[PDB]
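Quick one before lunch.
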Amino acid sequence: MYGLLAARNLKKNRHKRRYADKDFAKKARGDIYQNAVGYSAPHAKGIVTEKLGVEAKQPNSAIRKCVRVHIVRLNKKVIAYVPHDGGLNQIEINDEVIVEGLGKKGCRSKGDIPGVRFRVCKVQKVSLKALVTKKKERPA
Amino acid sequence: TKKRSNNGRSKKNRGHTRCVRCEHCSAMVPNDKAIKKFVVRSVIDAASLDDLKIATIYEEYEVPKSYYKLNYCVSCAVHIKLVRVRSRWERKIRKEQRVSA
Amino acid sequence: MMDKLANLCITINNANRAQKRSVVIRRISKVCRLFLESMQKHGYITDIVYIDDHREGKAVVGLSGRLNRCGAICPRYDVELKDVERYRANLLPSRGFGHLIVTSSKGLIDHRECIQHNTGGKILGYFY
Amino acid sequence: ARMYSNGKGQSKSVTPYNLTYPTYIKHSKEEIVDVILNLARKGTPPSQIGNILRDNYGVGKSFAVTKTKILTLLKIAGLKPVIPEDLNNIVKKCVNIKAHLAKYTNDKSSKYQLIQMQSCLYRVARYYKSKNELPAGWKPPF
RNA sequence: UGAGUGCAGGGUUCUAGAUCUGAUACAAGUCGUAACAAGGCAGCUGUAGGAGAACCUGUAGCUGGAUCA
RNA sequence: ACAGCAGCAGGCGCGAAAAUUACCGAAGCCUCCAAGAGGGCGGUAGUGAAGAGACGUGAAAACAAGUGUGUGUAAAAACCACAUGAGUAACUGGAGGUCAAGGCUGGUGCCAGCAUCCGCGGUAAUACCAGCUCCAGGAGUGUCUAUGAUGAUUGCUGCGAUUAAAAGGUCCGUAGUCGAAGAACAGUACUUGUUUGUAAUGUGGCUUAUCGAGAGCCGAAUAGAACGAGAAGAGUUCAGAGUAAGGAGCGAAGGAGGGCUAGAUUAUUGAGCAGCGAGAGGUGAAAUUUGAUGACCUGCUUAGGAGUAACAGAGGCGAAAGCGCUAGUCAAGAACGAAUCCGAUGAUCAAGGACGUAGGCUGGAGGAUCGAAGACGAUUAGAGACCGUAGUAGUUCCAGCAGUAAACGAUGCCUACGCUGUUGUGGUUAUGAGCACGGCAGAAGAGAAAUCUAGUAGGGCUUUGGGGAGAGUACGCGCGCAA
Ligand SMILES: [Zn+2]
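Model of the zinc ion complex:
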């Protein structure tokens, strides 16, 4: 394939090789639009339906606080994590929450939380960081 | 990792070889791999030759010998102690063994 | 069959490494002659004899102490005068010395003569 | 290397540096030219013509005296064969193998040799029917 | 020149489904112990039977073997 | 009856996502029968930390932002000039390592939480929650999401395939990519001149807004096309030329290479008959089991179906799978010797075609030995297994199907350049040596090492890998009687 007039053979061969890369393959041949946050959108709105808790992976020993969210844009139901110290207390059933990604290349689990892929950002139009640290109050 | 340069056998420039059967357990082993042993044993034991000298009718007599070639598989040769495990530099030394009696 | 200009290069490179002063090279073509004659002009090789054996051809050559390395490029890429310095920087060790040889309508010439004559060509080989 | 098998033999014979004229010989030009054309009409292949000239009449490579090649002389005399002698010897070997297999059908080694032989025939045919030495629709005797 | 609309078919993409069958994670549940030491019948590859379950048995092969002899 | 905002404002929805139902006889342009009329085209401001410049938040004597006039414009506001007051003006992320900066004090005790990654916390936490001091950037700083770089982890330049992932079981073969020396010839590619071909952007500059982005003027330019020029490489032809390129042929010889015909020495079983009169077999040790219907062992007769011991090897032959008794017969091949003939006929290979141990399947022949399945005897907690007794399909042959192996020297095929000693096999020999096919032991280089079919290298062509798993699995398709 290294001959001077071999360009056609060379091009067709090298194109076919790239499908061995996971990155190129997923963009070409996988379902890249299945996710609430990803290629489609940076943030997602949804309504809280259940409060939930999950164990951390070994060797850690903890209960992590999680929320069941119905996503307006897809009608899927997903699990999200609630970040801050007393954070679970700032959320009621049937509140609206905005939800965000964990920051890995694909949608992947982070740290010791098994199988959860998003986190809460805002509750009832206001920043959760401000709610928890008592800098601002619920809209009421 | 590769333990021996010759793969533990004497086959070179061939596809396939005849098999033979182990004396101790009848397992099949390739002829070019089998451990071989030669025996030349008198029909009459050394502890009887002094009686033979008065028993025989002939003026002189030569005792008949019996001849054998025996074959062994690796497991049997190691267990019967025809061969032993050796160090990484000793493995390379090749010398002909004695004929047994 | 091997390329004759590749064979020439490996034959002299190995013999130089083995610290021999002379070699016989066994298959020769028209551009092989011109390549060797180039190395003689720049003082990389000293003496050349050609044997007219009626079987292809063969050469006997004396090496100098100045030759570090030579090589052929395959295939022989076409280059504009704008392109040659890219290949110069890729192949040669220093901006101060060594030769990159190019075939042209004016014979074999080096990367300096290309500037003088204002011509590109096809890339052939190098030595330093 | 060899074309149908893994051979790398090197047995050949050296061609001389210069050819001269064979003054040690005991015949004229015209006699040698007569000897060739006789051997030709009797039906000998041109490679055998060469062997006889060397062995019996004492002339090496059969060209130093004539300034002309054996097959060209046969075309000048009009004695040219219908098929080139190489392609002709390939058809013969094929026929032989098919005549063996016709009675000893079980021989897998002979079957193997036939498919090799047959391939070589068509590769040679395509050479000659490009140089206009055979009619375009020529086919094997099979 | 033709919009619209009947009636059959196809081509695509999604979705329902009694029931069955994969995979993955199961702090540590039950039964054995197949592999790693000659792992207690040296191991492994193909093929064919058999079996709660790892697996076992015939046949040809390999050493990555416990032998460069 | 009327009606169609992917015109300008504006509203509702949808979403993670985007401004005023504002002024306009002025600037740039367009339209008419016009010393005039029209234009949401266009211009002017308002709104918003998408982007980009220049500067405030003090100095050691003495500091923005305000205000009033003038300007500015279509009218304005801002900008600039002079004149008045004065003394206002920092946050975001961090402080165990990567990675700049605290083992400080108090709470909490695998809780609550933190942490991109590695990891912290079970009562002595520089990592959680706070106080206090430090660090970094600063009118800005954190997070999420696509992409370029990191990355020689996509490799033209420039990676890999003995053992880490990775050379097709072996051949034939089309399309495709790649192809001697010598003497000559021609100009379409190739390279280059002149002329065309670029507003903005970008590039090399200079000049004016306090400065700096900004604005204004200049010069050269890509790919593409027109006409000339040069002939090294590539291309075409020739034969008083004949490759350590190929094919055809000659001579003497070598080999478990293959098909067929006709024979052979023993051995293992089975029957017949004769002799003898009590055990044989099997194991680590034993039991199933067989024997007075005479076993076992020793004779003589016979009947079958497999196989070729010892010699026999780091020996030979074959494309691989594979091939071992003796004669006769039938085709083709490899190597060697040499002054035979033809002349580029060649390398590698998608598609397509032929062979392929064993086990398996369809039909016929046959059936000694061995033995999956099945059945017993022992051993064990249990053995369905390992061991022993027995026993069927298969194991052999002819005519076919099938298409897999740790089909391995785990090392593709042609072709090169390469140190020494020793030992083989077959020819030839000036007897000094060579040519083809091997084994072995060092060296030098190489490599993560072990080691070396792995040294040197932009030679040609095909196959093939890209962190573990799921998975060589699902759906579709092609072959097969099925597997
Ligand atoms: Zn044994």
